[model samples]
Target chain A: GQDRSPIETQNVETVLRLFDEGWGAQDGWRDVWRETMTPGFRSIFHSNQAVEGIEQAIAFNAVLFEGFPRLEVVVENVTVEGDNVVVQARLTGAQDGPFLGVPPSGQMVDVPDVTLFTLADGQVIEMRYFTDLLAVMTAISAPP
Target chain B: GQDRSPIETQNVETVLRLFDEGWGAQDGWRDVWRETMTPGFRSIFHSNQAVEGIEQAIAFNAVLFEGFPRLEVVVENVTVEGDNVVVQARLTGAQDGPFLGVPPSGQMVDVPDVTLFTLADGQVIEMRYFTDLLAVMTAISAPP
Candidate 1:
């Protein structure tokens, strides 16, 4: 990603708009990116699994939706340099079930996540997400 | 950490050498940064703790060294984008003792981590790291 002035335009605006309107909007959020993502979109998830293509990118988020169902994303920071946009967000949600190899305890998990987006021609082409999974699982399965 | 033309230039060369000679080199590895970091350095860790000044930055890594005295860091990727450098690395080591609220199991922990470096005047001014702590804790405490 190249560094740009703080002014929001092109790539920066696209990602910022992505978060503002559709982030954490549940399953329907998948449809929100159909026009903003490239055909060869690639997503590298928390599981260390990498998936390519727009359809596969949407499919990969199924586990996240199934686990939390209603994650409220609080974006803390967003940086745009060149074609890359990095966002740091805090996610708060109740684990529904079968998440991170543990059964649901109806416990609320608060975790911090950082996601990087690579854009081409003002559309997201690739994304890499980072989070501390141990924190998530531990919070949702803590002692009663 | 501005985007360079993949040429080995100032900031990129500095960080590249940092990993090559000092990274994961145990305690002494810290001495190497005294000359490479800015005076008002800031470090944001995976623990959600942010510390300022180079001293605190060096002090924070003590916990990591305490947990895994012999961590070997394998750099996976490094990207430089205008005053920002992001590096992905894999750390492999044996648990020593009292780490991540778990007792010593001597099990190996291999985890992936991403760190972003912000440089000014070719010296690192700030750093932010991301990692999945649960993966590390679980790996080192798995059932025998």
Candidate 2:
């Protein structure tokens, strides 16, 4: 990002704030969700499958919160292009409850997540999550 | 890409050409590797673990070719920002040979791949691959 461009700098901050506060340690994630995303935002999953609206999106997060109550994300890379912000991040936590019929392993699982975000006027309008389902499953049944 | 910035349009072609020919059906991916990548390029992986140089990068493809001979990539999205181009794509192929000790499953594995690429003078200087290990594992051992 040469010059880093003027808007690109601001876009980088937008993504960092979400990581620092919303998905950060405080679990103040819920509030950040409300303040950061647009009303009809879409959470696009792999294969182009997506779920619309903020409440619905949060419901998905609710599932993770139930399973990994102490989940925290560390941002590794944030690349900007126009309204798009691509983040290479990782989710760290120990499974302390049930999820997908698997009980808590009580072992910390480090899952790498790379996501693409399309923002609109400083608020994220679309988010795509690149999740490794196999890693998630392995962490629960086979810690190695 | 509001203006799509004059240079951005060119960036789109450079990446698309790589996807079309280099990683396209003919398996002509090797030459494209040379044409599009710089000499000291790096293939960055999750956790920021990167393998340097083009040969090292091609060594990975060589392994994949041995396993999934008919592998081909479908470009779903190509986004550009500055010299950065992020691609959300999928690799479709059957595990027809041994990979990670798992015998050929003969069923195609639809693994979603989202990669971050940084280009220098129309040539790729860096690439980050988001591969799902669990999905690949499950496809070979337990295809459900």
Candidate 3:
């Protein structure tokens, strides 16, 4: 008899850990590449932007780190099913630089996002993420 | 040999047929219950609203149809993998009645939505749907 639940449980934890490390890893932190994610990991965003492979993740993450130094993401209501996991979260960060051609407004904004991850053999193989762009725009324009 | 490709020929045709039968069915169409869904069908919208059982789906759909008589949905990209089917589509309709207390403005709106369905023994057991709320509002405002 084998318990299949542990795989899902461990995968869920890894998904959350990756999210945190991807957001808050220090300047000299290279473990993200050395330890986290599979070699052929890929991610798709709400905007249909696809980042394939570890290099792509590093590049996309670079954009965020360079833009928002005070960024933080909190995962809420994580659900695990087999090797897949879905997380509901709110991310808050200051707009201090350019993001996808949008200029910074020096304002902190909270955006609700859902992230889905698929793990294979204890490493993340795929990810899909989306944010509430509607709420984001509303908050940014709220009579600051 | 069991073909595991998401684009299996037999499953692909069945998946599309299921989509047409599911989305194109009128509000409270009786055929939906007998021909399309399983006895224990359930769904949870990304908004956190959940629909349990086929009977509940009927009740939920009746009001929706009456409110949007011109409801038209077109399934675009569709994929089938094992017992799972995923569809992305555009929905357009004229909403001329109140929906959950939102007043109708006789507006025609178009919004993109994605639905994931899980099937058991050739009948739908679960369905999850997500749509762009702001896009719907804008479509209602500026009819196309």
Candidate 4:
């Protein structure tokens, strides 16, 4: 018996509500993860550099959070396809910490990201992320 | 009445097959377009620069074929969402022509692109495409 029902139409709204709360958190990510993720949670962040997992992967988000103390995301073009919900969104705010090994220059940065979320048992079990990092870096427009 | 009711299920497959055949020159593209595209069908070509619409988009392919002389696309990760199909694929060929005004530098270019196609009445009405130019540039580092 599967704990989660085969994805239904209602799952779209439930998952987006979860996503709205998840990406809105500016601090306390550890706590956020604990509450938002399922036991079997796995995340894949695909960037130009390489693909990385959330738990086992080295802490890239920490570096990002450090570099951008005020980073916030605004989601757009939310599309639900089967068991997944895909979002086109923007990450915008101040960068006061290290980004891509570059020292913080206190610049404003805005980056576009596309995310695909897979749900199970009312929790997000996995996320696949993609973005144009080079454009983001160029937009950051700061020296290390 | 839906004009495309007869070919709706096969439309996505037909588009991908045409994409494969057009690049390979195994078949002519205009015939494929006439058969599978709406009268006002449009597409986006993303590179260092942007080219829009089916007519403008074909120039990039013409230049590509001039150099590599042959182009083949392998469609992967297809997700059917209603009438929209999200297709991810890689194109492989020798460097022979410029893509999106970027000159060919005599290097093989392997690039991944995602195309979102919206079909109606058995023909594609519109498309939005995304690809990483930096990755393509890195892969094909030669001068036009």
Candidate 5:
């Protein structure tokens, strides 16, 4: 009798939870990226350049953290089908440093973002991410 | 016997093809939007305001057409899981008019954009879209 494998489904939840804890939090967030992503991972982003390799992707996160030090993400929905996982999240934070060529306005911004991941074995091999940059930029100028 | 239903998969391809022909092509594009979207459909966009109803969404597309008269999109990938279909595309055209508060510079822009559509009853009911506004803005000023 044929059956649906729960391995992919279970792994998706585990990896996404690790992502929320390690990437959404400032404490030991880097560990999540390092552990869940493969060495040759690739990232496609809407606002920034595409990155290859897990180290480069981690560096990109570092830059993002530099700009929004207190940023936190809440995953609103997570859907998994086979090897692909899609996550919709809300990101909120204060602008303390330069971001998207805009200087710090010391304002809080909240925007929705989505990420699509391609997982293989137990690691994420590819990710495509998008966010409403215009909305975030507008929020940056709003009164704190 | 448990297997993924072909209904979602087949509908996804058919709908995307209609979208490319009706949205990407210069002729009869509005017809696709009118016919394929539900009556009370909603569109969520990046770089523009959210629109409710098919008429309002059509108006939004009209404005985009006004800016990029010959605009066309190439669908690079489409992922369908459950009722959600995520499309990655490259949008290219010459800026012959104003767009996003920037005056036309007679420049051509090629940028990646993504749209996530929620389908029901073989018709799109809700759509969320995102693109790199910064990249498009920069392209508007680059030398042709």
Candidate 6:
């Protein structure tokens, strides 16, 4: 019989709260990631690119803040199983700067995303991301 | 105190077993959907189209089987929280016919997807699908 043994409910809540606060924070978001994740954390993006290490991931995600100064993410749902946590979220941001080689469109794009995080020893070690890149591009009127 | 009480783990397992069998079945998959989902079941597709009723959902998914005769879906992970079930899966198939207005190029397309199912009274009532449509289209060499 399978049970939630590796991770306790309290630890799950703690990790999820840290994750929510990190992504939702307006300033020092990367600091939260640094505080929560392991030094050798890895992230897989929607474009299938693998970013290694916490510092690298921080640098990679900084582009989003640069492009959308007021980007906001809302967590729609959270599910925990063992040492894994799955999140369903909605993203809304106004494009005021360049993103993925495209200049500012001044349009607000609403995006839905799902992510999975694998935790070990109370620290996030690996992450996988899924989203509709094409739809996001279309919503922002980016050239194909 | 929040707890996993609204739904039992066994019931969720049963529903997931039926769902896996239904999708993996070579024929008569609609029967399983009709048996497991409510009559008024609503499905949201990657294109954000709302399909009303189990019959409509069956009809909508038939396109995949028609286009990719050898399509197979492998469930990677399943998480249950209350009455909601979230699934991460990989879809692999060879394009032998047209799909989403794209002519077949005999290329193999591998897609990663995440889905959320809302269940009640031991039946699925609603489903939401998420995936990178542009990536799939690109893998099949569809025109921009």
Tens-digit lDDT track of model 5 for B21-135: 6683467778888888898989888635579999888888787777788887888776666677777788888988887666777788888887888888778898888888767
Of models 2 and 3, which has the larger lDDT?
A: 2
Clashes of each: 12, 3, 0, 8, 2, 0
Candidate 2, which CAPRI tier?
acceptable
DockQ of each: 0.35, 0.44, 0.11, 0.23, 0.38, 0.34
- The TM-score measured for candidate 1 stands at 0.76
Interface RMSD of each: 5.2, 3.6, 7.7, 9.4, 5.5, 6.2
- Which runs in model 3 stand beyond 4 Å of their true positions? A1-4, A24-30, A141-144, B1-25, B29-144
For candidate 6, list the clashing residue pairs, or say none. none
Off by over 4 Å in 1: A1-9, A38-40, A80-83, A93-98, A101-110, A120-123, B1-9, B38-40, B51-53, B93-98, B101-106, B120-122
- Better model by TM-score: candidate 5 vs candidate 6: 5
DockQ of 5: 0.38
- Residue-wise lDDT of candidate 1 within B98-126, one digit each (tens)? 67577878878676778888888778898
**Candidates sorted by DockQ, descending order?**
2, 5, 1, 6, 4, 3
* lDDT by residue (tens digit), candidate 3, B9-98: 444565566445544345444465557777677866554447888878766766666667667888865544456666667678877876
**Which residue pairs clash in candidate 3?**
none
Kindly list the per-residue Cα lDDT of model 2 for residues B2-22, writing each as its tens digit.
Answer: 466667778778877767777
- What residue pairs clash in candidate 2, if any at all? A81-B81, A134-B134, B22-B29
After superposition, candidate 6 runs with Cα above 4 Å error: A1-8, A18-20, A142-144, B1-7, B142-144
User: Model 6, B30-127: lDDT tens per residue?
Assistant: 77778888999998875475899888888887876677877778888777766778887888888888877888777787877777788887788988
Off by over 4 Å in 4: A1-6, A14-18, A28-53, A65-72, A90-96, A102-112, A118-126, A141-144, B1-11, B22-27, B45-52, B60-71, B99-103, B106-112, B142-144
What local lDDT score does residue A4 receive in model 2, on the 0 to 100 scale? 60
Q: Give the Å shift of residue B93 in candidate 5.
A: 2.0
List the candidates ranked by lDDT, beginning with the highest. Answer: 2, 5, 6, 1, 3, 4
Candidate closer to the true structure by lDDT (higher is better), 3 or 5: 5
Residues A43-98, model 2: lDDT tens digits: 87655468899988877767766788788787877777767888878788888877
What value does the lDDT take at residue A45 in candidate 2? 63
